[PDB]
Amino acid sequence: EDHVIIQAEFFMEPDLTGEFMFDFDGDEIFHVDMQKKETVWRLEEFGKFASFEAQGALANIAVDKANLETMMKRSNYTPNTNVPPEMTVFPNKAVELGEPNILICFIDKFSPPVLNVTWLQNGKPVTTGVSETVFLPREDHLFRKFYYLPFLPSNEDVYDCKVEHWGLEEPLIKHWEF
Amino acid sequence: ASFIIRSMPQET
Amino acid sequence: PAHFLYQVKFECQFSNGTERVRYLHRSIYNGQEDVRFDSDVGEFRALTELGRPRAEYWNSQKDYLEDERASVDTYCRHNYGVLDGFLVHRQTAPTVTVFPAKNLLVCSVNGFYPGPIEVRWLRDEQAGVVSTGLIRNGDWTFQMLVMLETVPRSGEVYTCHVQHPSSSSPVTVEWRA
């Protein structure tokens, strides 16, 4: 079929985190921030073409929570099975030395939706203009998330994306250079 | 131009 | 160590505009679909035992059932209306550039949306051509690394050709040997 519009919510205990997002043909439209209780368009431009009062999603999320407590009691506190992710580090544009680019770390086919992702420059942790998508939904109910390191091609310069998912024995780490 | 949401109800 | 997870996912599938609209409500506990309302069925179906009571109870809720039955209109058709206005027909043309690897040349289509594309090589062929496939960059752009092995034959031209529905006119980029 031609197009898809997924409204994906989740709640998880005891980390007590929510996500409420809208997807289209695989890319996020917007999501609601639980802390700032505000709509957050994936691209700023979408704010111009539509709106969504965030209080509806926090209503829903708070109904998701109660339903979690119920299913746990009903399921005899059987935990979620941790499925660990696969990973890809790759440049956003083609690489040309001295010209700004973005390094994408894409984390795929994992559950549950918790990640400790750490971007690394020549072995030194690095955070400058770092961004990440929300946890994106999949048809098998596992997840994917996108991490972005704004960076400058360099030849003599290696970047590592490390993830401390507790579906892993040891950190998963993928390198990239010129 | 407004997106509209479906809501779940609860379980006793 | 003991995490417990619950996913609600409301799905609208559209074909041929909005003359084919499928609604899917799914309740997913620890990654297993338990109960699902599907518009083409018209009622909740318990996928696992854990559902029965809810599906039973929800189909008994005559008022909510009509809400769900009607969602292909009030929810799907509506939300698609709003999308048609910017998202649905979003095009963004690629940024096609060629170079050697690590002979083996690499046609690098970048920044294109939506995904569907036709990348090809020529010697002014099929064999020697290796693609990554379509790659979500998560910013509503795709890329694709279509590479091609080649003996560096003297004064021969390799053209990488890219017809995407962004601009009717095909982008093409050359590399002389």
Coordinates of C-alpha atoms in Angstrom, one line a residue:
Chain A
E1 CA 0.0 0.0 0.0
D2 CA 0.9 3.7 -0.7
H3 CA 1.3 5.7 2.6
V4 CA 1.2 5.1 6.4
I5 CA 0.4 7.4 9.4
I6 CA 1.5 5.8 12.8
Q7 CA 0.6 7.5 16.1
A8 CA 3.1 5.6 18.4
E9 CA 2.9 6.0 22.3
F10 CA 4.7 3.9 24.9
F11 CA 5.1 3.9 28.7
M12 CA 7.8 1.9 30.6
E13 CA 8.2 1.1 34.3
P14 CA 10.1 1.7 36.5
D15 CA 12.0 4.3 34.5
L16 CA 8.7 6.1 34.2
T17 CA 9.4 7.6 30.7
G18 CA 6.8 8.4 28.0
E19 CA 7.0 9.0 24.3
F20 CA 4.1 10.1 22.0
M21 CA 5.1 10.7 18.4
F22 CA 3.5 10.7 14.9
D23 CA 5.3 8.9 12.0
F24 CA 4.8 9.1 8.2
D25 CA 6.2 6.7 5.6
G26 CA 8.9 5.9 8.2
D27 CA 10.1 9.4 9.3
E28 CA 9.0 11.3 12.4
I29 CA 6.5 14.2 11.9
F30 CA 6.5 15.6 15.5
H31 CA 6.6 14.3 19.1
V32 CA 5.4 15.7 22.5
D33 CA 8.1 16.6 25.2
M34 CA 6.9 15.2 28.6
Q35 CA 9.1 17.8 30.5
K36 CA 8.4 20.9 28.4
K37 CA 4.8 19.6 27.7
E38 CA 5.0 21.1 24.1
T39 CA 4.7 19.8 20.5
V40 CA 8.2 19.4 18.9
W41 CA 8.1 19.3 15.0
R42 CA 11.0 17.0 13.6
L43 CA 11.5 19.9 11.1
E44 CA 10.8 23.5 12.3
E45 CA 8.9 24.1 9.0
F46 CA 6.1 21.7 10.0
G47 CA 4.9 24.1 12.7
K48 CA 3.9 26.5 9.8
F49 CA 1.6 23.9 8.1
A50 CA -0.1 22.3 11.2
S51 CA -0.6 22.4 15.0
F52 CA -1.5 19.9 17.9
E53 CA -2.5 20.8 21.5
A54 CA 0.1 18.7 23.5
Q55 CA -2.3 18.2 26.5
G56 CA -4.2 15.4 24.6
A57 CA -1.0 13.3 24.3
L58 CA -0.2 13.8 28.1
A59 CA -3.8 12.7 28.8
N60 CA -3.3 9.5 26.6
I61 CA 0.2 8.8 28.1
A62 CA -1.2 9.0 31.6
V63 CA -3.9 6.5 30.5
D64 CA -1.1 4.3 28.9
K65 CA 0.6 4.3 32.4
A66 CA -2.5 2.9 34.3
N67 CA -2.9 0.2 31.5
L68 CA 0.8 -0.7 32.1
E69 CA 0.2 -1.3 35.9
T70 CA -2.9 -3.4 35.0
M71 CA -1.1 -5.6 32.4
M72 CA 1.9 -6.2 34.9
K73 CA -0.5 -7.4 37.7
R74 CA -2.4 -9.5 35.1
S75 CA 0.8 -10.9 33.5
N76 CA 2.4 -11.8 37.0
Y77 CA 5.3 -9.2 36.7
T78 CA 6.8 -11.1 33.7
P79 CA 9.5 -8.6 32.5
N80 CA 10.1 -7.4 28.9
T81 CA 12.7 -9.4 26.9
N82 CA 15.8 -7.3 26.1
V83 CA 16.5 -7.5 22.4
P84 CA 19.9 -5.7 21.7
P85 CA 20.4 -3.5 18.6
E86 CA 22.5 -3.4 15.4
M87 CA 24.4 -0.2 14.6
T88 CA 25.6 2.0 11.6
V89 CA 27.9 5.0 11.6
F90 CA 27.9 6.9 8.3
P91 CA 28.2 10.5 7.0
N92 CA 25.0 12.6 6.2
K93 CA 26.5 14.3 3.0
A94 CA 29.4 12.9 0.8
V95 CA 32.8 13.6 2.6
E96 CA 34.9 16.6 1.5
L97 CA 37.8 17.7 3.8
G98 CA 37.3 21.0 5.7
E99 CA 33.5 21.2 4.8
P100 CA 30.9 20.8 7.6
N101 CA 29.0 17.5 7.5
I102 CA 26.9 15.3 10.0
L103 CA 27.9 11.9 11.4
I104 CA 24.8 9.6 11.8
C105 CA 24.8 6.8 14.4
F106 CA 21.6 4.8 13.6
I107 CA 20.6 2.2 16.2
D108 CA 18.1 -0.4 14.9
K109 CA 15.9 -3.4 15.9
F110 CA 16.3 -3.2 19.8
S111 CA 14.0 -3.3 22.8
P112 CA 13.3 -1.8 25.2
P113 CA 13.5 1.9 24.4
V114 CA 16.5 2.9 26.7
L115 CA 20.0 3.8 25.3
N116 CA 23.2 5.2 26.8
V117 CA 24.7 6.6 23.6
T118 CA 28.1 8.4 23.8
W119 CA 29.7 10.0 20.8
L120 CA 33.6 9.9 20.8
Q121 CA 36.4 11.9 19.1
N122 CA 39.8 10.3 19.0
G123 CA 38.8 8.4 22.2
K124 CA 37.6 11.6 24.0
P125 CA 33.8 11.9 24.7
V126 CA 32.4 14.7 22.6
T127 CA 29.0 16.7 22.8
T128 CA 28.7 19.8 20.6
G129 CA 25.4 20.3 18.6
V130 CA 24.7 16.6 19.4
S131 CA 21.0 15.7 18.7
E132 CA 19.0 12.5 18.6
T133 CA 15.5 11.6 17.3
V134 CA 12.9 10.1 19.6
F135 CA 12.5 6.3 19.7
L136 CA 11.0 5.5 16.2
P137 CA 8.5 2.6 15.9
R138 CA 8.9 -0.5 13.8
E139 CA 6.4 -3.2 12.5
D140 CA 7.9 -5.9 14.7
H141 CA 7.4 -3.5 17.8
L142 CA 11.2 -3.1 18.2
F143 CA 12.8 0.4 17.8
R144 CA 15.3 2.6 16.1
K145 CA 16.9 6.0 17.1
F146 CA 19.1 8.4 15.2
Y147 CA 22.1 10.3 16.8
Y148 CA 23.8 13.1 15.0
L149 CA 27.3 14.6 15.6
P150 CA 27.9 17.9 13.8
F151 CA 31.6 17.5 12.6
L152 CA 34.4 18.7 10.3
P153 CA 36.2 16.1 8.0
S154 CA 39.9 15.8 9.0
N155 CA 41.8 12.7 7.6
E156 CA 43.7 12.3 10.9
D157 CA 40.5 12.1 13.1
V158 CA 38.5 9.0 14.2
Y159 CA 34.9 9.0 15.7
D160 CA 33.3 6.2 17.7
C161 CA 29.6 5.7 18.5
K162 CA 29.4 3.6 21.8
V163 CA 26.0 2.4 23.2
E164 CA 25.5 0.9 26.8
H165 CA 22.2 -1.0 26.1
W166 CA 21.6 -3.7 28.8
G167 CA 20.7 -6.2 26.1
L168 CA 24.6 -6.2 25.5
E169 CA 27.4 -8.0 27.5
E170 CA 29.8 -5.2 26.5
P171 CA 29.3 -1.8 24.8
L172 CA 28.6 -1.9 21.0
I173 CA 31.1 0.5 19.3
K174 CA 31.3 1.4 15.5
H175 CA 34.2 3.6 14.2
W176 CA 34.4 6.0 11.2
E177 CA 37.2 8.2 9.7
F178 CA 38.1 9.7 6.2
Chain B
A1 CA -4.7 22.9 10.2
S2 CA -5.0 20.5 13.2
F3 CA -3.9 16.9 13.7
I4 CA -6.5 14.9 15.8
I5 CA -5.6 12.0 18.2
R6 CA -7.4 8.7 19.0
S7 CA -7.5 7.9 22.8
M8 CA -7.5 4.5 24.5
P9 CA -9.9 3.9 27.5
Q10 CA -8.8 2.0 30.7
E11 CA -9.2 -1.6 32.2
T12 CA -10.5 -2.4 35.7
Chain C
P1 CA 17.4 -4.8 35.3
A2 CA 13.6 -5.6 35.2
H3 CA 11.9 -3.3 32.6
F4 CA 8.2 -3.5 31.7
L5 CA 7.0 -1.9 28.4
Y6 CA 3.5 -0.9 26.8
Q7 CA 3.0 0.5 23.3
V8 CA -0.2 1.8 21.8
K9 CA 0.1 2.3 18.0
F10 CA -2.8 3.8 15.9
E11 CA -2.0 3.0 12.1
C12 CA -3.7 4.6 9.0
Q13 CA -2.9 2.8 5.7
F14 CA -3.8 4.8 2.6
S15 CA -3.9 3.5 -1.0
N16 CA -4.9 5.5 -4.2
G17 CA -5.5 8.8 -2.3
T18 CA -8.1 8.0 0.5
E19 CA -10.4 5.5 -1.5
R20 CA -8.5 2.7 0.4
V21 CA -8.3 3.5 4.2
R22 CA -7.4 0.8 6.8
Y23 CA -7.5 1.7 10.5
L24 CA -5.4 -0.4 13.0
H25 CA -5.5 0.1 16.8
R26 CA -2.9 -2.2 18.4
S27 CA -2.2 -2.7 22.2
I28 CA 1.3 -4.2 22.6
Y29 CA 2.6 -5.4 26.0
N30 CA 6.3 -6.3 26.4
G31 CA 6.5 -6.3 22.5
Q32 CA 3.6 -8.8 21.9
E33 CA 0.4 -7.6 20.2
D34 CA -2.5 -8.6 22.6
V35 CA -5.6 -7.0 21.2
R36 CA -6.1 -5.2 17.9
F37 CA -9.1 -3.3 16.4
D38 CA -8.8 -3.5 12.5
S39 CA -11.3 -1.4 10.4
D40 CA -11.6 -4.3 7.7
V41 CA -12.8 -6.6 10.6
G42 CA -15.0 -4.0 12.5
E43 CA -14.4 -5.3 16.1
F44 CA -11.6 -6.0 18.6
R45 CA -9.8 -9.4 18.3
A46 CA -7.9 -10.9 21.2
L47 CA -4.5 -12.0 19.6
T48 CA -3.4 -13.7 22.9
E49 CA -5.4 -14.8 26.0
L50 CA -4.5 -11.6 28.0
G51 CA -6.8 -9.8 25.5
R52 CA -10.1 -11.7 25.8
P53 CA -11.5 -9.6 28.7
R54 CA -10.6 -6.2 27.0
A55 CA -11.8 -7.3 23.5
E56 CA -14.9 -8.8 25.1
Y57 CA -15.4 -5.7 27.2
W58 CA -14.6 -3.2 24.4
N59 CA -17.0 -4.8 21.9
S60 CA -19.6 -4.6 24.7
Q61 CA -19.0 -0.8 24.9
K62 CA -21.4 0.0 22.1
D63 CA -20.4 3.7 22.2
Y64 CA -16.6 3.3 21.9
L65 CA -17.0 0.6 19.2
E66 CA -18.8 3.1 17.0
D67 CA -15.8 5.6 17.7
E68 CA -13.4 2.9 16.5
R69 CA -15.6 1.8 13.5
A70 CA -15.7 5.5 12.4
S71 CA -12.0 6.4 12.9
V72 CA -11.2 5.8 9.2
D73 CA -13.1 9.1 8.7
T74 CA -12.8 11.3 11.8
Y75 CA -9.1 10.3 12.4
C76 CA -7.4 8.8 9.2
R77 CA -9.1 10.8 6.4
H78 CA -8.8 14.0 8.6
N79 CA -5.1 13.6 9.5
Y80 CA -4.3 12.6 5.9
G81 CA -6.1 15.9 4.8
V82 CA -3.6 18.0 6.9
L83 CA -0.6 16.0 5.7
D84 CA -1.6 16.3 2.0
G85 CA -1.0 20.1 2.6
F86 CA 2.8 19.7 3.1
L87 CA 4.2 16.2 3.9
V88 CA 2.5 13.8 1.4
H89 CA 3.9 15.4 -1.8
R90 CA 7.2 16.6 -0.2
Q91 CA 10.1 16.3 -2.8
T92 CA 13.8 17.2 -2.1
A93 CA 16.2 16.5 -5.1
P94 CA 19.5 14.5 -4.4
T95 CA 23.1 15.8 -4.5
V96 CA 24.9 13.3 -6.8
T97 CA 28.8 13.1 -6.7
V98 CA 31.2 10.4 -8.0
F99 CA 34.8 9.3 -6.9
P100 CA 37.0 6.1 -6.5
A101 CA 36.7 4.0 -3.3
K102 CA 39.2 2.9 -0.4
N103 CA 39.3 0.2 -9.8
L104 CA 35.9 0.7 -8.1
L105 CA 33.9 4.0 -8.5
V106 CA 31.1 5.1 -6.1
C107 CA 28.0 7.0 -7.2
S108 CA 26.8 8.8 -4.0
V109 CA 23.1 10.0 -4.2
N110 CA 22.4 12.1 -1.0
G111 CA 19.6 14.3 0.4
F112 CA 16.7 12.9 -1.9
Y113 CA 13.1 12.5 -0.8
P114 CA 11.0 10.5 -1.2
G115 CA 12.8 7.1 -1.3
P116 CA 11.9 5.8 -4.8
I117 CA 14.8 6.3 -7.2
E118 CA 16.5 4.9 -10.4
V119 CA 20.3 5.0 -10.2
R120 CA 22.3 3.5 -13.0
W121 CA 25.9 3.4 -14.3
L122 CA 26.9 3.4 -18.0
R123 CA 30.0 2.9 -20.3
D124 CA 28.0 5.0 -22.8
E125 CA 25.6 -2.3 -17.9
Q126 CA 24.3 -4.6 -15.1
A127 CA 27.4 -6.6 -13.8
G128 CA 29.9 -5.0 -11.3
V129 CA 27.1 -2.8 -9.7
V130 CA 26.7 -3.0 -5.9
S131 CA 24.2 -0.8 -4.0
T132 CA 23.8 -0.2 -0.2
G133 CA 20.0 0.1 -0.8
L134 CA 17.8 3.0 0.4
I135 CA 19.1 4.4 3.8
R136 CA 16.9 6.6 6.1
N137 CA 19.1 9.6 7.4
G138 CA 16.2 10.4 9.9
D139 CA 15.9 14.1 8.7
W140 CA 13.4 13.1 5.9
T141 CA 16.3 12.4 3.5
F142 CA 17.6 9.2 1.9
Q143 CA 21.1 8.3 0.5
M144 CA 22.3 5.4 -1.6
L145 CA 25.9 4.3 -2.4
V146 CA 25.7 2.7 -5.8
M147 CA 29.3 1.6 -6.6
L148 CA 30.7 -0.1 -9.8
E149 CA 34.0 -2.1 -10.4
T150 CA 35.9 -1.0 -13.6
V151 CA 39.2 -1.6 -15.4
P152 CA 40.6 1.9 -16.0
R153 CA 40.3 1.7 -19.8
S154 CA 42.0 4.8 -21.5
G155 CA 39.7 7.7 -22.4
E156 CA 36.5 5.8 -21.5
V157 CA 33.6 7.6 -19.8
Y158 CA 31.5 6.3 -16.9
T159 CA 28.2 8.3 -16.4
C160 CA 26.1 7.8 -13.2
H161 CA 22.4 8.5 -14.1
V162 CA 19.7 9.4 -11.5
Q163 CA 16.0 9.8 -12.4
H164 CA 14.0 10.8 -9.2
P165 CA 10.5 12.4 -9.1
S166 CA 12.1 15.5 -7.5
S167 CA 12.8 17.1 -10.9
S168 CA 11.5 15.5 -14.1
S169 CA 15.0 16.1 -15.7
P170 CA 17.5 13.4 -14.7
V171 CA 20.7 14.4 -12.9
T172 CA 23.8 12.8 -14.5
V173 CA 27.6 13.0 -13.5
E174 CA 30.6 11.9 -15.5
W175 CA 34.1 10.5 -14.7
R176 CA 36.8 10.0 -17.4
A177 CA 39.3 7.1 -17.3

